Amino acid sequence: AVKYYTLEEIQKHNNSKSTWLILHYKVYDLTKFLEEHPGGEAVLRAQAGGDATANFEAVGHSTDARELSKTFIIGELHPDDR
Numbered sequence: 001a002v003k004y005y006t007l008e009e010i011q012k013h014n015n016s017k018s019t020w021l022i023l024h025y026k027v028y029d030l031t032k033f034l035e036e037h038p039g040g041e042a043v044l045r046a047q048a049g050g051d052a053t054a055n056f057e058a059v060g061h062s063t064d065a066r067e068l069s070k071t072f073i074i075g076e077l078h079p080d081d082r
């Protein structure tokens with residue numbers, strides 16, 4: 001099924017193990033991609049656990065990168081949040 005995640009639940013995934021984040025109300029686990037991500041782990045980590053939409057777009061990310069993101073899609077932002 002799809003499953004949605006609350007800001008809370010996503011928040012708990014900001015550290016040492018699980019880097020989740022929200023881009024455009026869509027939740028992405030990239031925790032295993034930290035080193036792999038050619039923008040550094042640190043910035044992903046720092047932005048983990050919440051809205052990183054503005055950060056993501058402010059940096060800017062190609063079509064490839066946008067499509068890549070979907071491969072790391074776990075679900076969406078809970079309809080209670082938005």
Ligand code: HEM
Pocket residue numbers: 021023028030037038039040043044047052055056059060061062063064065066068069072
């Ligand atoms: C949706 C998940 C993400 C994927 C799949 C992804 C993928 C990529 C890829 C492939 C690039 C290379 C640039 C391109 O070809 O577009 C990149 C660069 C970069 N990303 Fe991400 N990214 C993600 C999320 C984020 C987030 C949340 C941040 C914000 C903190 C971030 C910050 C950066 C930075 C700073 C660069 C390097 C920009 C530069 O120095 O030129 N990324 N990313």
